Amino acid sequence: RYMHNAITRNTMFVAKDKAPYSDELEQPVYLDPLARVEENKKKLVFSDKTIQSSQSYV
Amino acid sequence: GDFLRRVEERFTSSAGTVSLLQNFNQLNEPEQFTADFFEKFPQAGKQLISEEDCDYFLMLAARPGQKPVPFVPVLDERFEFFFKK
Amino acid sequence: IKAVSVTSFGFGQKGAQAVVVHPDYLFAVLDRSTYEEYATKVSARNKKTY
Amino acid sequence: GIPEDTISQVDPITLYVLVATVEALLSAGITDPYEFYKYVHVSEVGNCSGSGMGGVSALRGMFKDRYADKPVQNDILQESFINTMSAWVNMLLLSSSGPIKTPVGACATAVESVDIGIETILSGKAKVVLVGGYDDFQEEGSYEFAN
Amino acid sequence: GSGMGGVSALRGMFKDRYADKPVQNDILQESFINTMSAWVNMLLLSSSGPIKTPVGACATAVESVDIGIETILSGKAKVVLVGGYDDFQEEGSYEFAN
Amino acid sequence: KMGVPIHAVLAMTATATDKIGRSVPAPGKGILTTAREHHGNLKYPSPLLNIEYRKRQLNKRLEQIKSWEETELSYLQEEAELAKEEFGDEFSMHEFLKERTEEVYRESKRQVSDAKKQWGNSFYKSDPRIAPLRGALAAFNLTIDDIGVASFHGTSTVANDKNESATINNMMKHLGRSEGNPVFGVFQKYLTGHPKG
Amino acid sequence: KMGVPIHAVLAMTATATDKIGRSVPAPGKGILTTAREHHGNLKYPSPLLN
Amino acid sequence: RTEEVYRESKRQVSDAKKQWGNSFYKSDPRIAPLRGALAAFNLTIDDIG
Amino acid sequence: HSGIRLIEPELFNGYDPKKKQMIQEVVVQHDLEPFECSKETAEQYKHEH
Amino acid sequence: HSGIRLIEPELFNGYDPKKKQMIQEVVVQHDLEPFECSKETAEQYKHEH
Numbered sequence: 001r002y003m004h005n006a007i008t009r010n011t012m013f014v015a016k017d018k019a020p021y022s023d024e025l026e027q028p029v030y031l032d033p034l035a036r037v038e039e040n041k042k043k044l045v046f047s048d049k050t051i052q053s054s055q056s057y058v
Numbered sequence: 059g060d061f062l063r064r065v066e067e068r069f070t071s072s073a074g075t076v077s078l079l080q081n082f083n084q085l086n087e088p089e090q091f092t093a094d095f096f097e098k099f100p101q102a103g104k105q106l107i108s109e110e111d112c113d114y115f116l117m118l119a120a121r122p123g124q125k126p127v128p129f130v131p132v133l134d135e136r137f138e139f140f141f142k143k
Numbered sequence: 144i145k146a147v148s149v150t151s152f153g154f155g156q157k158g159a160q161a162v163v164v165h166p167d168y169l170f171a172v173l174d175r176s177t178y179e180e181y182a183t184k185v186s187a188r189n190k191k192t193y
Numbered sequence: 194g195i196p197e198d199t200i201s202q203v204d205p206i207t208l209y210v211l212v213a214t215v216e217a218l219l220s221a222g223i224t225d226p227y228e229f230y231k232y233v234h235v236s237e238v239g240n241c242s243g244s245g246m247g248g249v250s251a252l253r254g255m256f257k258d259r260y261a262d263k264p265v266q267n268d269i270l271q272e273s274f275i276n277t278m279s280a281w282v283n284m285l286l287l288s289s290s291g292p293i294k295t296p297v298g299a300c301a302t303a304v305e306s307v308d309i310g311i312e313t314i315l316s317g318k319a320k321v322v323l324v325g326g327y328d329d330f331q332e333e334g335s336y337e338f339a340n
Numbered sequence: 341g342s343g344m345g346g347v348s349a350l351r352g353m354f355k356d357r358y359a360d361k362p363v364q365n366d367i368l369q370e371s372f373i374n375t376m377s378a379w380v381n382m383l384l385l386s387s388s389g390p391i392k393t394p395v396g397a398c399a400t401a402v403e404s405v406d407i408g409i410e411t412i413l414s415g416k417a418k419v420v421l422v423g424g425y426d427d428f429q430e431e432g433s434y435e436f437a438n
Numbered sequence: 439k440m441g442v443p444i445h446a447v448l449a450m451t452a453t454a455t456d457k458i459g460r461s462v463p464a465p466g467k468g469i470l471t472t473a474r475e476h477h478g479n480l481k482y483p484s485p486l487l488n489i490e491y492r493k494r495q496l497n498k499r500l501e502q503i504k505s506w507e508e509t510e511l512s513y514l515q516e517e518a519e520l521a522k523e524e525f526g527d528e529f530s531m532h533e534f535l536k537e538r539t540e541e542v543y544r545e546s547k548r549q550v551s552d553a554k555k556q557w558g559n560s561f562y563k564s565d566p567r568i569a570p571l572r573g574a575l576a577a578f579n580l581t582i583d584d585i586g587v588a589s590f591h592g593t594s595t596v597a598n599d600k601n602e603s604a605t606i607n608n609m610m611k612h613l614g615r616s617e618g619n620p621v622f623g624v625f626q627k628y629l630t631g632h633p634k635g
Numbered sequence: 636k637m638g639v640p641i642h643a644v645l646a647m648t649a650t651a652t653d654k655i656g657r658s659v660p661a662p663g664k665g666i667l668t669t670a671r672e673h674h675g676n677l678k679y680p681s682p683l684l685n
Numbered sequence: 686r687t688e689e690v691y692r693e694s695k696r697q698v699s700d701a702k703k704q705w706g707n708s709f710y711k712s713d714p715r716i717a718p719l720r721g722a723l724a725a726f727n728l729t730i731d732d733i734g
Numbered sequence: 735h736s737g738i739r740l741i742e743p744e745l746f747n748g749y750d751p752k753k754k755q756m757i758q759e760v761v762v763q764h765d766l767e768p769f770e771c772s773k774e775t776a777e778q779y780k781h782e783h
Numbered sequence: 784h785s786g787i788r789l790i791e792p793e794l795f796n797g798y799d800p801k802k803k804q805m806i807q808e809v810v811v812q813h814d815l816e817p818f819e820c821s822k823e824t825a826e827q828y829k830h831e832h
Contacts, residue, residue: 002219002224003219006194010194011194012194012212012215012216012219013194013195013211013212013215013286014194014225015194015195015196015199015285015286016226016285016286016288016458017458018458019288019457019458020227020230020235020288021235021457026457026467027467027470027608029235029474030235030236030290030467030468030470030471030474031470031471031473031474031475031569031608031609031612032234032474032475032476032477032566033234033236033474033475033476033566033569034234034476034566035234036230036231036232036233036234037227037230037231038231039231044225044227044228044230044231046230052476052477052478053478054478054479055478056476056478057476057478057479057566057567057688058688105193106190106193144586144587145580145584145585145586146449146575146580146584146585146586147585147586147587147588147589148585148587148588148589148606148621149402149588149589150402150469150588150589150590150591150602150605150606151398151399151401151402151591152398152399152465152469152591152593152598152601152602153276153396153397153398153399153400153403154271154274154276154277154280154397154398154462154463155271155274155276155277155279155280155281155283155284155293155462156280156283156284156293156454156455156456156457156459156462156465156466156468157276157279157280157293157294157295157396157399157403157453157454157455158399158453158454158456158465158466158468158469159396159399159402159403159406159451159452159453159454159469160402160450160451160452160453160469160472160571161402161405161406161448161450161451162448162449162450162451162571162574162575162585163446163447163448163449164446164447164449164575164578164580165446165447166444166445166446166447168447168578168579168580169444169447169578170444181441183441184440184441185441185442185443187441188441188442188443189443220640220642221639221640222638222639222640223639228637229637232636232637234471234474235471236454236468236471236474239455240455243395246371246372252350252354253354255431255434255435256350256351256354256355256431257354257355257358259431259434259435259805260355260358260431260804260805260806261805261806261808262805262806262807262808263808267438268438268463269435270432270435270436271462271463273344274344274395274397275373275395276395276396276397277462279455280462281462283455283458284458284459284460284462285458287455287458288457288458289455290454290455290456290457290468290471291454291455292406292452292453292454292455293396293403293453293454293455294394294396294403294406294407294453295394295395295396295403296392296393296394296395297341297372297373297374297393297394297395298374298391298392298393298650299372299374301650304648304650305391305392305393305650307645307648308390308392308416308648308649308650309392309407309410311645311648312407312410312411312414312416313410315414316410316413316414317563317564318406318410318452331746331749332746332749332754333353333354333357333358334368335751336353336357336754337353337357337367337368338368340365340366342635343634343635344634344635345635357756358755358756358757359756359757359759360756360757360758360759361759366660369659369660375659377652378659379659381652381655382655382656382657382659383655385652385655386654386655387652388651388652388653388654388665388668389651389652390649390650390651390652391650391651391652392650396453397634397635398591398593398634398635399453399591400635401635402451402453403453405448405451406451406452406453409448409451415711415712416649424633424635425635426633426634426635427635428634429795429798430795430798430803432634433800434803436634482686482689484689485686485689486689486693526678530678530679533676533678533679534678534679535679536679537676537678537679538679538682541679541681541682541683544712544713545683547712548704548711548712549704552700552704556696556697556700563696564692564695564696565692567689629786629787630786630787631787644726646722646723646725646726647718647719647722647723649718669717669718669719670717670718670719670720671717672714672715672716672717672720673714673715681713681715681716683709683710683713683716684716684724753830753831755831756827756831757806758824758828760818762815763816763818764815764816766811766813766815767812767813769809769812775807778805779807781802782802782804782805
């Protein structure tokens with residue numbers, strides 16, 4: 001699906017503009033080896049509930 | 059004595075101090091003099107002869123006007139020059 | 144000094160970091176005989192390199 | 194779909210590396226790069242690729258062009274590099290923090306990069322790593338290969 | 341491996357030949373970055389261990405150490421030279437200035 | 439074994455890509471990730487840091503390995519007459535054993551060294567609770583409080599000299615340096631310059 | 636675990652430096668060393684291959 | 686500490702596996718690398734196509 | 735127009751292998767005609783000649 | 784003469800930062816004086832001008 005859409009609309013490569021983390025989260029992700037992106041609004045973004053969460057070590 | 063002059067010259071640093079060898083006539087019994095001397099220079103008992111103090115040694119061993127050395131120090135083109143003279 | 148950090152930064156966001164712990168803490172993992180036997184060979188190599 | 198800005202700025206070979214990388218990830222069934230971060234930490238998506246002599250179009254610019262004082266982009270030297278390609282890759286697609294390395298085996302450079310990739314992954318340093326090679330043909334390179 | 345080693349030869353092949361100054365014929369073999377370790381093995385080691393060559397232009401001598409470790413611990417090699425090197429020349433300085 | 443001068447012990451080394459941007463010259467704090475770890479709840483501290491726990495584990499694994507090896511040496515007797523009749527009518531119980539016994543030795547040696555590297559060298563490689571920069575030293579029973587110096591990149595530029603300090607401070611903070619135990623900054627680039635490569 | 640297409644499995648990979656010389660462009664057989672092994676006596680074949 | 690036990694058991698599991706199937710040859714001269722690489726997959730040198 | 739073919743200059747900023755450009759070090763023998771230029775350009779010309 | 788100092792040109796083939804050399808694209812306005820040259824050099828001049 002993606003390839004067909006792209007090769008038709010010349011958007012195979014979509015340049016990223018903002019990182020998955022936010023500037024206020026760009027460090028706290030770096031220190032947690034378990035904080036990983038969750039998805040919302042059809043976007044894969046880092047949150048705060050994922051950083052140093054108490055449930056990612058069950 | 060001229061060799062010990064280089065030894066002490068080596069193992070000392072910015073001293074301007076007195077040499078333990080003031081008169082070579084002290085060497086008329088070296089057996090004890092050197093033995094006590096190497097106390098003021100302990101590491102000379104463990105650091106190897108340096109090259110600049112080795113070629114100097116050879117240059118002593120063939121200085122003119124001196125009785126030829128009673129041994130052979132090296133194997134070079136001057137081998138007989140140390141072997142026969 | 145126990146250990147030293149070495150961080151260095153490059154263009155295009157290729158930075159890196161090294162950490163150098165003192166040699167002594169290595170020698171303490173190994174028994175006496177090996178350390179003493181290694182020391183002798185080191186001494187020999189030292190004179191040879193000198 | 195590369196934005197016209199980047200096109201106007203960077204060395205042609207970077208275009209090639211990007212258009213390769215995107216459809217490489219596609220060939221991996223990856224739609225957007227960030228999908229990796231759902232299963233792996235950000236510091237574990239490296240890029241162990243690198244050119245043989247990439248940037249020749251910019252090396253020309255900084256050596257033989259400026260000597261002529263032709264109108265030249267100011268910061269060309271940041272593209273004359275060889276890690277500057279993987280730089281653009283991470284800057285535009287991955288935004289990751291995994292191990293960047295950059296081999297140069299000019300002829301046999303895309304295979305040694307794979308060895309680096311393996312010594313990387315098996316070390317646990319990274320769980321995903323782009324690995325490949327790239328290079329551009331230009332005049333000054335061809336003339337000297339001829340001679 | 342270097343950061344951009346060979347600048348003296350890159351100059352030769354780009355800005356010198358364009359002037360057709362008398363230039364060594366095979367300069368391009370030195371303009372490389374692995375060509376240094378090449379000469380090292382050719383003149384000293386004559387070995388066959390793993391040659392690699394990082395380019396981290398500024399932070400390039402540390403990443404080379406990471407490569408050295410991922411190499412050795414892999415058992416790929418038991419001894420590996422690892423370091424960096426680079427040369428200062430004109431065309432490099434002018435562009436750092438700009 | 440060669441007898442060379444061990445000048446140092448490279449414990450840790452890593453690299454990193456900083457973050458999505460539009461300017462190559464600007465650095466970032468990607469290298470911080472050498473120290474990220476997990477801090478949700480410490481009621482049960484990771485027993486893997488206690489050097490004696492790992493010591494007794496290594497011990498009990500080594501006794502297991504040596505018992506395994508002494509068992510396999512006994513196995514090798516029967517294995518000879520059970521696999522020499524079927525390769526050659528002659529019975530080289532001398533050379534066949536002097537081959538396969540020493541192979542047993544080597545395959546025991548590898549397990550020995552693997553247990554050792556699993557419990558002392560890289561016992562942390564799969565754990566989030568042990569940041570790399572900690573476990574690296576902790577191999578030597580060292581604390582993060584013992585990185586004495588930090589040889590800074592320090593290229594006398596505006597952004598570098600602040601970013602480097604920022605990363606060092608933050609990573610020494612996350613690892614829990616004892617407060618008031620700062621690392622010293624040495625800046626050879628003042629004296630030697632910046633050898634761009 | 637991601638569910639991606641496994642196109643291949645890189646089993647082996649190595650590199651090598653060929654031999655002392657005076658000409659960079661000439662290659663050599665250094666890469667051969669990925670296959671060197673020991674062939675003294677095979678009465679007891681290495682049980683580790685089975 | 687129970688789940689830590691799980692992880693430290695998992696590492697030993699994977700280490701034994703990589704010691705006996707992945708890289709069982711890394712320390713042996715009798716197994717040339719290019720052979721043992723395949724032999725991990727129960728392959729013969731006769732199969733590099 | 736794809737694959738190994740003769741090099742097409744429009745892909746290489748006018749690099750025409752038939753007319754590879756070079757500059758020749760040549761010493762003038764008769765002073766040229768005076769031409770107008772800019773201020774700092776004239777200054778650089780003087781300083782470098 | 785050691786450590787960070789002002790750049791000494793004899794270490795860099797006459798690179799004098801005070802007199803960094805550059806070439807200026809300039810269009811002639813009056814034909815120069817005819818000068819003698821070699822055969823193939825003349826041919827290249829003609830082919831490239």
